[model samples]
Target: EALLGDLATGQLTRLCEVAGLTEADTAAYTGVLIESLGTSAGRPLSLPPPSRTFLSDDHTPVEFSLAFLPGRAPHLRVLVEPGCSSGDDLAENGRAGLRAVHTMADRWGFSTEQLDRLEDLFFPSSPEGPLALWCALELRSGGVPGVKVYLNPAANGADRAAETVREALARLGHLQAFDALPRADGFPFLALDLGDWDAPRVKIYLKHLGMSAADAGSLPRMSPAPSREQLEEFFRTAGDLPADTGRLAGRPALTCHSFTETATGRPSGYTLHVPVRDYVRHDGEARDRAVAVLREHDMDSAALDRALAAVSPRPLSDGVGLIAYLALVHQRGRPTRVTVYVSSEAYEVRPPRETV
Candidate 1:
């Protein structure tokens, strides 16, 4: 009895140590581990043959494999084709990849949290840049989970992307869930938030890698005032900026950015543009109606005031049109902020800090 009890305690201790799990959480893991090892004393047991699915108009196949390791736990590996060929397709393809993951979770009884973890892995820190990524999941013997991830070199050179993932995991506390898995030259081991999975999460931690530490620290500060010239420059530099040469409210109108566009200059969804003030100036009723529409959507009057005040004289939107507004507030900020009003949304830009 002493030996049996000691063995169980040691096993539980190691699980807790590796995954930082609590005693209460190890019960289910203990049952699963014992059953798994019994089924595979010295060899891994495959649960079911891996399956594959096609995405991106059935052009790309995403594969999934599941097996239980000898002394470890259940292992899941995902291999996905480069559904996205360019930066333009990365976001859309990334969403499609996540949808595929959702389907797998539904089929396999994986929890939403598990699905979310899978989502984070597929669309890791730099999801937008990678054409293809690999994700490995170890559902440890005692219900503990660990992960390793890497991007395909053709998508974004493995070494560079791994550095970003490594740096991000270190900040995210990589030691708890992962036991320092040996990393290959170009493929680094990515980390996960193993403790308290339900806590509020940070989707993309590597965002700060492109900016200075100081710039990241001052995220709350309002962006410096921007000039109309800066806005024009942003659209011009954006290359392939969507523009509408037509007129809005009887004045010249142009699109600064769009969510969807064809090479032939047709855009259909998620579009935004600045306004022509002269057109709105002559129609005071248009401005009042716009503000009223925003208020009805529960927009904070103060935030709207500050945002508008911050970008004065610059037309926010065509007062009469219902299209989204895209403004350049600063250089370093990402699409500034989004505002939801009746039948419209706005994406504001902010200038980066002058020094950093």
Candidate 2:
């Protein structure tokens, strides 16, 4: 579709909100989209070229339709729509899935032909489908310079998808601009598993915890989330005790520690976030053993004692997890606060309330 030479206040506002664009950033994005779509003022063309139709594994067809609204200022909106179905008879059991794909493709005007060609290259018959699809869209969209290109923010493969897009954009020499978008790091903590509902796996992330870009060269090294083997080893190493650290919902989780800032600017202390679904109260003996290990290695002896005094089993409230607090008082330096937070929900920021 041709780019409007001027944008109406409402059109500009909507586009800015959709792309998270500022006044400065809007022109560049609009220019890129216009150029990439091969459109210009007064001469607009539909995207997907009317020839690009997509198909699901079950052979449903889908396509994209582009429309430009004309008023005080002109604007373009892309929608996907179902293309003509082949009407070939197929199994009734699997019909819905392909139909759904057709609906989505048609709604977005995404090309089935492009998808078919890119499927082998991007989607492949593996777990990498979502990532490849995400990347493919960005690339197909002419690598719209510096925008965060996430089609489904909560997809199971969203993180991987971001990684894939980064790699692809870099290969195309567009990485630097694309990386400028806010929070483009791909939320490793958020996951969307469409199949599971009740016991969703959002409490804890199953990835290595790393340092921020600014702190990449400082203090402690990157902290890694523990594996089941490591958790078992931790219990054994602590006091030669065998304990059930327990599973959150169904997935196994381990306590991982990371430093965070408090209101005062000093290290508020390391948090032992047991990022797993549901809260698990440590068994009495297990708590003792865990405390003993912390005291021996990280926690100050006196500090540990004080923390234990206030230690209690806190329940999950407001979808936030529970945590076991362990305060530390160093003999040489500032005191530290340590906490083992049980998984409650998968979130980026800390909950407003401790129990929440």
Candidate 3:
């Protein structure tokens, strides 16, 4: 498909040529871009509905439909947020928030090779300028399974929380399979090494943070099936990230499979869910459930809340969105795709670079 044709006036021809080039190149180039940014094509970037809205220029306010295409490696994408000016402080803050992930990843021991690869592909010449890095590594066979956190200047966090996440990962050492980069804008974060999303150790890690079997059982949505558009809509509108966005900004960021399920519905040891569930809104409803669980166990509510707070890893934002394994339902039941909502702070490849 050649993108140029001398069918119109020079000015119009130029515009058509540009648009045609974009349209002609979008799929191929974007596909490669997503692949490079993604970990694996088997595990591609699963975006929220294109209708989703976000703050880009805060004052100008823009909207875009987000989508994902399969690639050869783990894939991710960072969309230009809506509702904010290009040079406005809001866009900068959004990018900054992404930087927190780098600080956390570095301390957690995530490999720099992968991060460098991603940086060279997406940034090439540093589109977001200087980035503060963090990552989390999940070592596997020859092919390592992991998550790399990249907080973007487009998201703010000019290094504040990113440093916090890196410091905590280095000092705490209790983060068996987690890490973070911290920032000041509300709790900016970046992280790496979320080991075996389907292992038992991961489940116990959630338990230590106060999630229970029932909590595990009542997964927000995903795996079991897709969330209703209505519920997803509400969550998209209501699920806000926490202010304490640290290195492990896990709170409010949808998650499942961190804990396990058993016959009697007990912890059954901290095991990972074979089929990870959906990440849902962690609002009053979730908080109320936590409170109820504490009362049921005859445990101190304050202590439970504190524990939950200690691990409220979700990022802080205007709403809640989720990410889950799309394979739980789609693609022949392989836990490959780690789906994410546009509202969440994650990454995706631009495609052309990724496909290569």
Question: Please, what is the whole-model Cα lDDT of each candidate in the order they appear?
Answer: 0.30, 0.27, 0.27
User: How many clashes in candidate 3?
Assistant: 105
- Highest lDDT: which candidate? 1
- C-alpha TM-scores of all predictions: 0.24, 0.24, 0.23
What are the runs in model 1 whose C-alpha is more than 4 Å off?
1-88, 112-130, 133-160, 167-173, 176-184, 188-356
For residues 202-267, write the lDDT of model 3, one tens digit per residue: 121111132333332243322333334422322322222222221212332223222122222222
Stretches of candidate 2 exceeding 4 Å from the true structure: 1-187, 190-250, 254-286, 301-321, 324-339, 342-356
Off by over 4 Å in 3: 1-110, 121-191, 194-286, 294-300, 305-356
Worst 10 residues of 3 by lDDT: 1-10
Sorting all predicted structures by lDDT, with the top scorer first, yields 1, 3, 2
Error of 3 at 99 (Å): 7.8
Cα-based lDDT at residue 313, candidate 3: 40
Q: What is the lDDT of residue 149 in candidate 3?
A: 42
